[PDB]
Amino acid sequence: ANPCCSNPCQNRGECMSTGFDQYKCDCTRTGFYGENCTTPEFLTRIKLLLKPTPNTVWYILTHFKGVWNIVNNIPFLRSLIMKYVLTSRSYLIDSPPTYNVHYGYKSWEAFSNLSYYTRALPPVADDCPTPMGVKGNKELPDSKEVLEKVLLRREFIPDPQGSNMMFAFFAQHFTHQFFKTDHKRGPGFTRGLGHGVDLNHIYGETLDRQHKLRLFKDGKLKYQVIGGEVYPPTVKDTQVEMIYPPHIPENLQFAVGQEVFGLVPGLMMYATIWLREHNRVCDILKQEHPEWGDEQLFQTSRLILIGETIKIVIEDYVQHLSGYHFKLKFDPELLFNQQFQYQNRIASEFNTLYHWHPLLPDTFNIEDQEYSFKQFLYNNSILLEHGLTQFVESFTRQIAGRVAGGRNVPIAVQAVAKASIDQSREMKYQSLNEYRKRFSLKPYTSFEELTGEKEMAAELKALYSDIDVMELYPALLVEKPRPDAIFGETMVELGAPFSLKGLMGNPICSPQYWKPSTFGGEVGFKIINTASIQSLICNNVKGCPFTSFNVQ
Amino acid sequence: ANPCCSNPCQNRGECMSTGFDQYKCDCTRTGFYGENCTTPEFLTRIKLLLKPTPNTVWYILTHFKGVWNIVNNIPFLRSLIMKYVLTSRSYLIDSPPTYNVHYGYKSWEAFSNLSYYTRALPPVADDCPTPMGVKGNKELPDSKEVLEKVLLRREFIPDPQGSNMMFAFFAQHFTHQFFKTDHKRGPGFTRGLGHGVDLNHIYGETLDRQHKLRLFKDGKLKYQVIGGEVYPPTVKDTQVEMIYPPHIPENLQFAVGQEVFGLVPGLMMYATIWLREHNRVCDILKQEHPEWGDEQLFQTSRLILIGETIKIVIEDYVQHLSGYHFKLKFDPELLFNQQFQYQNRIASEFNTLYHWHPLLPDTFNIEDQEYSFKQFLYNNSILLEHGLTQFVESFTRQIAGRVAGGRNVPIAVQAVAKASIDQSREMKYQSLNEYRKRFSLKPYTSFEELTGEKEMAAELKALYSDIDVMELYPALLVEKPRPDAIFGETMVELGAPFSLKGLMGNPICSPQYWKPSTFGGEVGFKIINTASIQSLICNNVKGCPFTSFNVQ
Ligand SMILES: *[C@@H]1O[C@H](CO)[C@@H](O[C@@H]2O[C@H](CO)[C@@H](O)[C@H](O)[C@H]2NC(C)=O)[C@H](O)[C@H]1NC(C)=O
Ligand SMILES: *[C@@H]1O[C@H](CO)[C@@H](O[C@@H]2O[C@H](CO)[C@@H](O)[C@H](O)[C@H]2NC(C)=O)[C@H](O)[C@H]1NC(C)=O
């Protein structure tokens, strides 16, 4: 019924109904005009020829390594390029946010209600004839069939980029502070009202939860010592609610910021490391400020660990998966002379892109042991058995699975991979090509172009019939990977804008926050600016084991 | 004890303790250096000579009326000047926000907790020897003595700018959507979690309250017809909670967005006007969009009334009290090529500046009646008796009191004016001169310089002894007024940055929102851009009575 169901407006134009069977496109500041905003203005036509393809920019950044060696050592030039990286990506994000799962039009409810994930593209109207709008059949192909044919893992396909389990669990740990779906309300809702990197997975979402976790001495968080090693406190000691099976002994019920981090020892490993990092920073700040109280020591340490997290994510984590030879740089000053909104709203699609199920291995290999999913889940006894040192060394060695390329989703999490499909449909997501156009990508003309091969493409064509009906999430996992890369084009070109906007949109990156006094002086400021995944492990894990996000 | 108690850092430098009796100033991006950030850099020294005094800029804007007549009709030039107005003011505001009543240092608690008013200046630390830091005596002068000597009204002093009661009640009505002190928590807390112009005083703060107020037909709000006139619904009919004395008849207990607007008929008058405006806009939008449902009609009308509100505040309301001959302009496009944060956090100080107690008259003169405070309070029967038309005509005629100049606080509200003083001390406000310096003003060197006279100045000197101890709030009401103006310099130079930042910081002023489709097309967009305090009254009040923010 809705005349906008066909998504007629192009180039980020906005569609509005002007009757029961008529519409109008708002071409304001899109650079285009005409009925569907497809006729480019003069300046627009120029940029279309100048601006390079994303597979060209990716090529430049991931090749000419000898040239980048020169550029990386020229601070002026390095800053110039990183500046362009930050600005060009964040331009794709609406800020302040617009739509959510319940509003395909702008409204104060959509803006003000922080319980929603926001949406980069509006939901398909409920009164639309087809799930994608007007194209396709009355119902999308069976999600179980999509899963089994092109998603489920036959043989384990390792990541050619060499991403290890330190990378895998970091991603899971890091993103679970702003991906906290409120399953009581629905998949389009979140419990992470900070909508960013606030480290609530360490300190707790609520003030009540934070105080139960705090020692209230020297700004530190509560902890316990087991075998001479520092571990998180227990549920019994702090009364913070955690998610554990009833058969789990209460001395193994560790209490941390995020309630689900008891799920896997890999998450509990990072929770422990970050816990130690907080208290380490407390000691350092106390050395500098003996006149400071517990409260200021805590708050300043939290701001410092936020800085470290963003530092590490940009210069280690993102640096790895991007495959760039350009040396990425966390420098908030790069945006001080730029137009930039220091705010963020977590997008539903960003959460969907981050469903990296194929990343998981078939077994979790710690030391000489090889644990199954059943043995690994909710089993912190494994962590106490081997220790953090053995955990880091083992996870540094074990490679992770390739995400793009198809058929690499471990069958142990098939219900989870199917939920992504189902829930994406439940949230009325628009098609793959709609999202590609939204982020300046050309639509795929065939399933073969999408997969880069023949077999899976044929399988998908039997299911979806039309390429313009192809869903976003399963397309990410079967997409033709970039040359020896872990991802396809869609994953990176869509995800980077959400990521960098979330990282740089943090208030500590703003000019009034980004100064030594915010972090207790130059000493605390230096902790942020010299942070790395290696130094994080070195300072907090016994023996200072070598670590990295790739296998050696 | 705290080495920062003397507020040693100048030019918005930040003070940090480096020991029990030592400090360090963070001079980052202040334009100054040295121990106290008092030594100007070269570029800074230039601007100091170039940049004009606020009492000179005010002079230019409020004089040379013949010249402004030419400028106002040159769209390029008018836009250029309004641009500078918006940018130069908003630069004084920290955005994202920093301090609150409980944090004199930056912290994630201070940033993330929206229940706090933010603070333009940090509170004086609790372990400071004197209430202002180090200067003055152990305790500030008795607030009752300050009140009775230089604040309380002897003879009614009318506003020379001709501000009427339409202005007074507009101010009270308008500001009570973001000044909603949570008295359960303390004076530094707020219930207005939107921290801006969201019109929650019309639509309710919570979703539960909004749905009780809505008709769920044609996007409209519930209403009742009394004597052929449209008035708000009752508490009994809608079950929304309002604040009323137990003796108030339930047919007179009107239910509106703000729970306190039953307090005075002046507020209920505006609540009724805006209620009618929402339903009027619903009719217009329904005419254009018969295919729209109740929800979209409601949401779009709300965004439109938000636009009208900002439009009226800038071009009628602010236009009046500013005294400018320059024609102010609400144009979000003026900031599209500028650096600006589309966000806002309501400052405690802005609330304190807005305690315009001297504005109130001695009686509320409606038609041929003259009501006392006792008769006027909680008496909506007055509103039904005379009607909206008579209210508008009467309030347009009745002049309001001068705010600056001293001794004009009506004794009927002395308990409220005393509370303003006491709560300011409770929230540990810094001195008047500290806040003047914060907003680029020179400190007052004497009480005579502050008041511009002799008698009140002597009174204050006996109470405060030192000018550097003089409090902010009572200083506003006794300050030497600008020539034939309602305010002194401090009130305007401090308030204008808070005001304009809140208005333009609204998400509908952002480039992604500021387009016709957001407001249902050009017809709705036109409503915002042609809104005025007169058109608001003309469209919604029978007879289209003349109205204005000044007496005729
Ligand atoms: C914002 O800060 C206020 C003040 O600290 C918090 O209110 C306190 O909440 C605790 C519960 O954890 C109560 O025991 C205190 O009595 C409250 N104090 C006051 C003054 O009300 C509030 O919880 C914080 N809000 C958020 C969202 O964290
Ligand atoms: C944000 O939106 C959600 C969804 O509309 C609101 O949750 C609803 O709240 C009402 C109460 O007013 C309940 O009757 C519904 O069952 C809730 N729905 C869901 C899906 O949870 C929520 O209240 C909104 N948040 C705010 C702060 O207004």
Ligand SMILES: Cc1ccc(Nc2c(F)cccc2Cl)c(CC(=O)O)c1
């Ligand atoms: C779904 C997704 C997409 C891209 C990235 N990172 C990334 C990338 F893979 C290439 C260039 C820049 C960035 Cl920020 C990430 C990881 C991250 O930035 O948090 C996730």
Ligand SMILES: Cc1ccc(Nc2c(F)cccc2Cl)c(CC(=O)O)c1
């Ligand atoms: C305490 C206070 C100070 C200044 C103003 N308005 C105002 C003014 F009085 C002069 C110049 C610009 C502006 Cl925005 C106002 C009114 C307002 O904008 O809400 C209140």
Ligand SMILES: *[C@@H]1O[C@H](CO)[C@@H](O)[C@H](O)[C@H]1NC(C)=O
């Ligand atoms: C705009 O799009 C509609 C539907 O997508 C199409 O039928 C029409 O031809 C288009 N108009 C143009 C391209 O001018």
Ligand SMILES: *[C@@H]1O[C@H](CO)[C@@H](O)[C@H](O)[C@H]1NC(C)=O
């Ligand atoms: C948990 O891990 C330990 C190894 O430390 C193993 O012995 C035990 O069987 C595991 N528990 C389950 C339920 O698999």
Ligand SMILES: *[C@@H]1O[C@H](CO)[C@@H](O)[C@H](O)[C@H]1NC(C)=O
């Ligand atoms: C800085 O301020 C302190 C206290 O206000 C003062 O004692 C000191 O002399 C100042 N230092 C300067 C102005 O260099």
Ligand SMILES: *[C@@H]1O[C@H](CO)[C@@H](O)[C@H](O)[C@H]1NC(C)=O
């Ligand atoms: C309320 O106003 C009416 C006039 O409409 C007046 O007669 C009455 O006395 C007032 N009520 C009180 C309690 O003063």
